Amino acid sequence: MKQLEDKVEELLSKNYHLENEVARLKKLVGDLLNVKMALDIEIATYRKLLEG
Amino acid sequence: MKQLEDKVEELLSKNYHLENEVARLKKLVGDLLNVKMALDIEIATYRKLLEGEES
């Protein structure tokens, strides 16, 4: 029952790559949320200064 | 034998849910990228108006 064996190895590889992609995107989300925090701080500085 | 069938079922199922998660994350990324673009243009404009900074 090989066709089954090839399918399983094919699926284990896809699973490994999907786990990789999930890890990559989580990091990109953390990094972007950190970026948002820093920009929000810069804008707050400007707005506060512009306000008076 | 039937174990192979069970493993095939398990993997197709785990992969389906990982794909769903990948799609969710990519939407969140796209959303954060758009929030960043709006913030960037606001900051770039203040730099220009107040500091004489062009990109």
Side-chain angles (χ1 to χ4, degrees):
Chain A
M1 22 174 35
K2 134 143 184 142
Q3 216 24 25
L4 283 169
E5 299 164 34
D6 290 3
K7 197 36 124 166
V8 170
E9 204 75 36
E10 182 192 0
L11 296 178
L12 280 162
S13 169
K14 289 187 180 171
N15 180 90
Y16 172 88
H17 297 300
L18 287 155
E19 293 186 332
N20 179 267
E21 180 70 350
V22 170
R24 177 185 74 80
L25 287 158
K26 291 172 178 165
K27 176 51 160 53
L28 180 53
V29 168
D31 286 353
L32 287 170
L33 278 164
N34 281 336
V35 161
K36 172 181 181 299
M37 172 175 327
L39 292 174
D40 275 343
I41 286 165
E42 300 193 298
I43 282 169
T45 291
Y46 277 116
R47 297 200 54 191
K48 170 89 100 201
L49 281 174
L50 273 166
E51 270 146 347
Chain B
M1 29 291 182
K2 143 66 191 332
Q3 199 187 349
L4 279 163
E5 307 190 321
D6 277 358
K7 174 67 48 183
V8 170
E9 186 184 39
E10 179 190 348
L11 288 171
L12 286 164
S13 282
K14 287 184 172 168
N15 291 353
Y16 175 65
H17 291 291
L18 295 163
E19 288 169 344
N20 296 345
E21 184 171 6
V22 167
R24 186 76 178 276
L25 288 168
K26 285 175 187 190
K27 183 182 180 311
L28 300 196
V29 162
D31 291 348
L32 283 166
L33 283 173
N34 294 333
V35 161
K36 184 180 167 299
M37 186 160 35
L39 307 173
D40 279 340
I41 302 175
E42 180 175 358
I43 287 156
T45 301
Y46 293 143
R47 291 194 174 136
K48 193 188 260 231
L49 293 168
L50 312 184
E51 295 172 63
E53 261 221 79
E54 319 259 295
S55 69

